[PDB]
Amino acid sequence: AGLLDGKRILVSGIITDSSIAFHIARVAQEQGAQLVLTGFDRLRLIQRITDRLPAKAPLLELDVQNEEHLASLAGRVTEAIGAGNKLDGVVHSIGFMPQTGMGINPFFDAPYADVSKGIHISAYSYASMAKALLPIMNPGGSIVGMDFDPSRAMPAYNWMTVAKSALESVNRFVAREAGKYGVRSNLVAAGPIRTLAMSAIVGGALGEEAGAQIQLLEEGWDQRAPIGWNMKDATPVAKTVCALLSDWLPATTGDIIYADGGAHTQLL
Amino acid sequence: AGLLDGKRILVSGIITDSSIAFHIARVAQEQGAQLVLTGFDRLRLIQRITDRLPAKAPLLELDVQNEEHLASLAGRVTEAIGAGNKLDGVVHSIGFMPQTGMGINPFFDAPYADVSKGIHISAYSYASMAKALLPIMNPGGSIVGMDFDPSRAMPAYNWMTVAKSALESVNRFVAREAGKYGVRSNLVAAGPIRTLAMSAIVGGALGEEAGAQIQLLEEGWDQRAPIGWNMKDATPVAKTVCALLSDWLPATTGDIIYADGGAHTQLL
Amino acid sequence: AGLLDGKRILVSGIITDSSIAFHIARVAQEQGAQLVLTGFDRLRLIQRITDRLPAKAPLLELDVQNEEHLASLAGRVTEAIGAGNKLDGVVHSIGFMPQTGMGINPFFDAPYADVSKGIHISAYSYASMAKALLPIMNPGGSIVGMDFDPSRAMPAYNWMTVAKSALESVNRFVAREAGKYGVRSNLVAAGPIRTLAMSAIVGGALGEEAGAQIQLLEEGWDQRAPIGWNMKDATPVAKTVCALLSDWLPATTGDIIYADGGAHTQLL
Amino acid sequence: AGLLDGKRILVSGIITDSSIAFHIARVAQEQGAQLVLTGFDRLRLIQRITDRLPAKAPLLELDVQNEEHLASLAGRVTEAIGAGNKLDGVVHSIGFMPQTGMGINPFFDAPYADVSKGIHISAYSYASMAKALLPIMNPGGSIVGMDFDPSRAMPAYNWMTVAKSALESVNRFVAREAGKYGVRSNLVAAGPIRTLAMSAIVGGALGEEAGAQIQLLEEGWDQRAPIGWNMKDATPVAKTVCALLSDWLPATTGDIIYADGGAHTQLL
Numbered sequence A, B, C, D: 001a002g003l004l005d006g007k008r009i010l011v012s013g014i015i016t017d018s019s020i021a022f023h024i025a026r027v028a029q030e031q032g033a034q035l036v037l038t039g040f041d042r043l044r045l046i047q048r049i050t051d052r053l054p055a056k057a058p059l060l061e062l063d064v065q066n067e068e069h070l071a072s073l074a075g076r077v078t079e080a081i082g083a084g085n086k087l088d089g090v091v092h093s094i095g096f097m098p099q100t101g102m103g104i105n106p107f108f109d110a111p112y113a114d115v116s117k118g119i120h121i122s123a124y125s126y127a128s129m130a131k132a133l134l135p136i137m138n139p140g141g142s143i144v145g146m147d148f149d150p151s152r153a154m155p156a157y158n159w160m161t162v163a164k165s166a167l168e169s170v171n172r173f174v175a176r177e178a179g180k181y182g183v184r185s186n187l188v189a190a191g192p193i194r195t196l197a198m199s200a201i202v203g204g205a206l207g208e209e210a211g212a213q214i215q216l217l218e219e220g221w222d223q224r225a226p227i228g229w230n231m232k233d234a235t236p237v238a239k240t241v242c243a244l245l246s247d248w249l250p251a252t253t254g255d256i257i258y259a260d261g262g263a264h265t266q267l268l
C-alpha cells in the first residue's frame, strides 16, 4: 500500500547516487512505483548506480539535445513497460549550465552559445520530454520538473537562474498541453543540494571565491528556513516529487511546489 | 495503508455537509486519521452533520472570537485524545465576512466594525489557533489553513479578499513560530466551492447582480484551469489538505499550495 | 517649470520633519504643487513643523478612526482650495501599529484590539480616504499610499507586515473605484527609513534586542540593494511618490512601485 | 524645463512609426533629451522613419546577434555624442520570436533553433547591450527594457512569453552590474500594442484563429484595466519609460514597472 502503488513512472537525470533523481527513484520504488529510467552519455556509470536502487528498472539512453532520442523515446518506453501499458508519471530531473554562465565567471562574460546550451537542456527539454511522453501517458498522470527559485537574483547561479525563470514559464505552457490528456504538470523548487556540480564548486573547482559564495547561500538558506535546511539531504525533495506524482494533489497544475524548508517565504 | 494512518488531527469549520472542512474530515478519516472536531454556534446541527462522517469523532465548541474558548482549547483537546497524546495535525477551515464587505455592497460602504469582525475570524484566528494548539502538537506536525487567492482584485469578494491577503501574511509568521516545534504551517488556496454563503449568493440572496458575478467568476475559473474546475466538488481540495497533513510535503512551510485546477497560472 | 506644476495635492501624515510625508510635501512644493495638509492629534505641534516647509499650506485635522472627520473632509478641503477647484493628488502617509504587534513582543502575544487598531489606521483608512476624496478629485488624478514589502515574513515588523499585506489588497480595490473617476491608485514600497518609531526602537525604547534587529535589517537592505540604501534619506522615496503624482506614469494603477534600492529583487 | 532636459539617451528598436521605440524617442525629444538611435537590417527605411521625429538624431547600425556590432558599439556611440561625453540613458526596445514559437503554431512544434534565436534577441541582448554601454554611462544613469508580463501562460504568445520570463531574470542580474556604475536597470511591462507583428497577426497573417485570440486578449485587457487600455496608443508606455530614464525614480532597480492600465492587478 505505497503512495505510488502500481504507478508506471519514468525518472530521468540519475548520474550519481547523490543526484536528486536517484533519491526520487529510490522513494518512488519504496512507495510501490514501477520505474523506467533514462540516462545521458555515461550509461555504464549510470547502470552501476541504478543497480544500487531497491528494485530493477530498465535504463534507456536519452540525450535531450538529440532529436533521434526524443523521436524514438515513446516507442522505446512502450517496449520496456509492455504494449497496452502507459506511464502514470514523468520526472524531468535534467539540468546543466556551462562554467561560463554559472560560478565565478562575470555574468556579462557568458557566450550565448553556452547560455543557449544551458537553456536547451534545463528549460526547453521540459517541453521536449512532455511532447514525447504525453501520447503514452494515462489520464490522472503527472509530469514533475526540478526548479531552483529564480524570482530574486543571487551570486554564482547567474545564467542557471535565467534558465530556471525560462523553465517556470515553459511549465505553465506544458500544463496547457498536459491538461488535454488529463495530466498535471508541476515544478518542485528545491533548496540547494550537494550534487555533482555543487560538491565540485564548494570543493574549489571554480576557485575559492565561488566555493565561498555557495556555502554562504547554503547557510542563509538554513537560517531563513523556519524548519531548517540540510543541503546534504535530498530525501525531503524526493518525497515532495512523489507527492506530486501521487493522486493527493489532484487540482494542482502549471504550478511550483517549494521543498526548501520554507526559506523563500522569509526575508531574514 | 491509509495516508494519515495513526495521525491525530483537529478539524475546525464544519457547518454543513457542503463545508470544505466536512470533506477534509471525511477524506482524513478514509485515510486512517483519528479526528477531533470543532464547531461554532449551532453545535446540535453540527453534531447531526458530523454524524454523516465515516467514523465517530469528538465535537468541541470553539468560537475563535471567544478568549475563554481559546484558553481552554488545548486542555479540552487533550481530554478528548487522551493524556500523553498530542496532535499531529490542525485544520483551520474558518472564514466569515459580513454582507457589507462581501457581495454587491460597494467596497467603500463596508463599516470597519464589519471588516474587523471578518479579519478577526478569517485571518487573526489562524495565529490564535496556532498559539493555542502548538504546545500540544508533535514534531513533524502540520497546520493547514484555507485561502482564496487574493493577489488580484476581483468583483464581489471585496473585503474577504483583503482578509485573505492578511491571512497569507499571518501564515508566514505562524510558520516562524511552528518551526520551533518542528511543525509546518501552510495554506491551501482553493478555487470557488458551492458552500453555504456561495450557494446563497448564486441563489440570489444578495440580488441578481451578485449571483451573476460569482457564476461568471466560476465559469472563467473552469476555462482558465488546464484540468478544469468543478465548483460543486470539494474532494480535490480535501485531498490537497490531507497531502499537507501527511509526511509527503516535509520541506514546505509558510507556504501556499494551489488546489484550483491551475487557474491562477493562466491568463486566459 | 516643476514636475507637479499647478497640481492641487493633499498630503497626510506629517508628525516630525523626519516623517516620509514631510519630505513628500517638501519635494511636491519644490516641484510647483499647491498643497493641503492633514494632521492627527497634536495639530498645534504639527503646524510648527509644517511652518518649516518651503511654502505655506492649509493644515486640516484628520483622525482616520473618526467618522465625523472623514464625513466633513471633502467639504473642509474644498473650503481650503476654493470652490470650483478639485484635487489632482492624494498622499496617504498614515501608519501605526501598537508595540504589542511590532517590535520585540512575540507575534502570538498581540491582542486583537491592538492588531485591529493598526489595520484600521494603516490599511482600512486608505479606502476611507479614497471614499472621502474621490468625489473632489480631477480626472488624471493620483492616490499614493506608503507600503513596506510584506511578501516575505521578517523579524520585528510582525503585525505591521500583516497590515501592509491587507493595505496591498485595499490598494487593488481602491484602483477599481478610482478608475471610475479617471484617477490612479498606487503604493510606494519604501525601504526602512529612520522616522519617529524607528529611531525610538534603534535608541532602545523596546530594549536592546529590538534595536539590534532593526539595524541588522537595515544593514542587509543596503547590502542587497544594487544601488545601496540610506535609511536616513527619505528624499528618494519622496521623489518616487512625486513621480506617481505626476502625469509620467499614466497607465499604472492598483500597483506597487518599489523605492527600496532594488533590495527586494536580490536574495543576497 | 523638460523631464529629460540635457540627458544623452540611446534608443534602440525603431522599425516603423508604430514601434514602441518610435514613441519613446519622440517623448524623450519632447522632454529635452539628446538621442542616439540604433536600427537593425533596413537602415535606409529606419532613417526615413526617424526623420519624422521632432529632432535630428544620429542613427547607428546594431544587430544584437552580431558580435562585431556590440564590440564597436560604445566607440561608435562616443563618436556620435562627442569625446568626453557619456550616456545618461539606454532604451532596449528589441524583441523578436519566429512564427514557429509565437502565433497559432502548437507550443510543442517550435524548433529549438527558432526558440534560441528569439531568446538571444529578446532576452540575452539586454545583458549584451548593458555590457557594451555601461562603460560609457554616467552615474545616476538608467537602462530600460521592454517586457510583456509572462507570469501567467496565455494563448498565442507561447515562446515569446518564455523569452520574457528569461528577460525578467536577466534584468535582475543586469541591475547587479549596473549598480557598480551607479546606474539603474528596469523593465516596463506594457499592455498589448499594435506594432508590426501584432497588426500582422490581427490582420490574419497566421490565420483567423490567431487574429481572434489576440483580439479577445486585447478586449479582456481593457476590461480588466481599471483605467482602460488602448492597444493603439503607445504614448502612455513611452511616458513610463521616460519616467524611468528621469531622476524621479532614483531608488528603483532590478525592477518591473507595469504600464498596462493596471490590468495585471485585476482578475475580472
Ligand SMILES: NC(=O)c1ccc[n+]([C@@H]2O[C@H](COP(=O)([O-])OP(=O)(O)OC[C@H]3O[C@@H](n4cnc5c(N)ncnc54)[C@H](O)[C@@H]3O)[C@@H](O)[C@H]2O)c1
Pocket (backbone or CB within 6 Å): A012, A013, A014, A015, A016, A018, A019, A020, A021, A039, A040, A062, A063, A064, A065, A092, A093, A094, A095, A096, A121, A122, A146, A147, A148, A149, A189, A190, A191, A192, A193, A194, A195, A196, A197, A198
Ligand atoms: N542541487 C541543487 O542545488 C538544485 C536545486 C534546485 C534544482 N536543481 C535541479 O535539479 C535537477 C537535477 O540536478 P541535480 O542537482 O540532481 O544534479 P545532477 O548533476 O546529479 O543531475 C543533472 C542530470 O542532468 C543530466 N543531463 C545533462 N545534460 C543532459 C542531456 N543533454 N540529456 C539528458 N540528460 C542530461 C545529467 O546526466 C544528470 O543526470 C536539475 O534540473 C537541477 O537544475 C538542483
Ligand SMILES: NC(=O)c1ccc[n+]([C@@H]2O[C@H](COP(=O)([O-])OP(=O)(O)OC[C@H]3O[C@@H](n4cnc5c(N)ncnc54)[C@H](O)[C@@H]3O)[C@@H](O)[C@H]2O)c1
Pocket (backbone or CB within 6 Å): B012, B013, B014, B015, B016, B018, B019, B020, B021, B039, B040, B041, B062, B063, B064, B065, B092, B093, B094, B095, B096, B121, B122, B146, B147, B148, B149, B189, B190, B191, B192, B193, B194, B195, B196, B197, B198
Ligand atoms: N468556498 C469557497 O469558494 C472558498 C474558496 C477558498 C477558500 N475558502 C475558505 O475555506 C474555509 C471554509 O469555508 P467554506 O467555504 O467551507 O464555508 P463554510 O460556511 O462551510 O465554513 C466557514 C466556517 O467558519 C466557521 N466560523 C465562522 N465564524 C466563526 C467563529 N467566530 N468561530 C469559529 N468558527 C467560526 C463556521 O461555523 C463555518 O464552519 C474558509 O476559510 C473560507 O474562506 C472558501
Ligand SMILES: NC(=O)c1ccc[n+]([C@@H]2O[C@H](COP(=O)([O-])OP(=O)(O)OC[C@H]3O[C@@H](n4cnc5c(N)ncnc54)[C@H](O)[C@@H]3O)[C@@H](O)[C@H]2O)c1
Pocket (backbone or CB within 6 Å): C012, C013, C014, C015, C016, C018, C019, C020, C021, C039, C040, C062, C063, C064, C065, C092, C093, C094, C095, C096, C121, C122, C146, C147, C148, C189, C190, C191, C192, C193, C194, C195, C196, C197, C198
Ligand atoms: N519608516 C519606514 O521604514 C517605512 C517604510 C515603508 C513604509 N512606511 C510607511 O510610511 C507611512 C508614513 O510613516 P513614517 O515612517 O513617515 O512615520 P511617521 O511616524 O512620521 O508618520 C506616521 C503618521 O501617521 C499618522 N497617524 C497615526 N494614526 C493616525 C490616525 N488615526 N489618523 C491620522 N493620521 C494618523 C501620524 O500622526 C504620523 O504623522 C506609514 O504608512 C508607514 O507604515 C514606513
Ligand SMILES: NC(=O)c1ccc[n+]([C@@H]2O[C@H](COP(=O)([O-])OP(=O)(O)OC[C@H]3O[C@@H](n4cnc5c(N)ncnc54)[C@H](O)[C@@H]3O)[C@@H](O)[C@H]2O)c1
Pocket (backbone or CB within 6 Å): D012, D013, D014, D015, D016, D018, D019, D020, D021, D039, D040, D062, D063, D064, D065, D092, D093, D094, D095, D096, D121, D122, D146, D147, D148, D189, D190, D191, D192, D193, D194, D195, D196, D197, D198
Ligand atoms: N507590442 C506589444 O504588444 C508589446 C507588449 C509588451 C512588450 N513589447 C516589447 O516591446 C519591444 C518593442 O517591440 P514593438 O512592439 O515596438 O515591436 P517592433 O517590431 O516595432 O520592434 C522590435 C524591434 O526589434 C528589432 N530587432 C529585431 N531583431 C533585432 C536584432 N537582431 N538586432 C537588433 N534589433 C533587432 C527590430 O528592428 C524592431 O525595431 C520588444 O522587446 C517587445 O517584445 C511589445
Ligand SMILES: Cc1cc(N)n(Cc2ccc(C(=O)NCc3ccc(F)cc3Cl)cc2)n1
Pocket (backbone or CB within 6 Å): A095, A096, A097, A098, A099, A102, A103, A148, A160, A195, A196, A197, A198, A200, A201, A205, A206
Ligand atoms: C540549480 C542547480 C544546481 C545544480 N547542481 N544544477 C544542475 C547542474 C548544473 C551545472 C552542471 C555542470 O556541471 N556545470 C558545469 C560545471 C562543471 C564543473 C564545475 F565545478 C562547475 C560547473 Cl558550473 C551540472 C548540473 N542546477
Ligand SMILES: Cc1cc(N)n(Cc2ccc(C(=O)NCc3ccc(F)cc3Cl)cc2)n1
Pocket (backbone or CB within 6 Å): B095, B096, B097, B098, B099, B102, B103, B148, B160, B195, B196, B197, B198, B200, B201, B205, B206
Ligand atoms: C472566499 C470565501 C467563500 C466562502 N464561502 N467563504 C467563507 C464564508 C464567507 C462568508 C460567509 C457569510 O455567511 N457571510 C455573510 C453572508 C450571508 C448570506 C449571504 F447570502 C452572503 C453573505 Cl456574504 C460564510 C462563509 N470564503
Ligand SMILES: Cc1cc(N)n(Cc2ccc(C(=O)NCc3ccc(F)cc3Cl)cc2)n1
Pocket (backbone or CB within 6 Å): C095, C096, C097, C098, C099, C102, C103, C148, C160, C195, C196, C197, C198, C200, C201, C205, C206
Ligand atoms: C513599516 C513602518 C515603519 C514605521 N515607522 N511605520 C509607521 C509607524 C509604526 C509604528 C508606530 C508606533 O508608534 N508604534 C508604537 C511604538 C511606539 C514607540 C516605540 F518605540 C515603538 C513602537 Cl512599535 C508609529 C509609526 N511603519
Ligand SMILES: Cc1cc(N)n(Cc2ccc(C(=O)NCc3ccc(F)cc3Cl)cc2)n1
Pocket (backbone or CB within 6 Å): D095, D096, D097, D098, D099, D102, D103, D148, D160, D195, D196, D197, D198, D200, D201, D205, D206
Ligand atoms: C510580446 C511582443 C509583441 C510584439 N509585437 N513583440 C515584438 C515582436 C515579436 C515578434 C516579431 C516577429 O516578426 N515575429 C515573426 C512573425 C512575423 C509575422 C507574423 F505575422 C507573425 C510573427 Cl510571430 C516581431 C516583433 N513582442
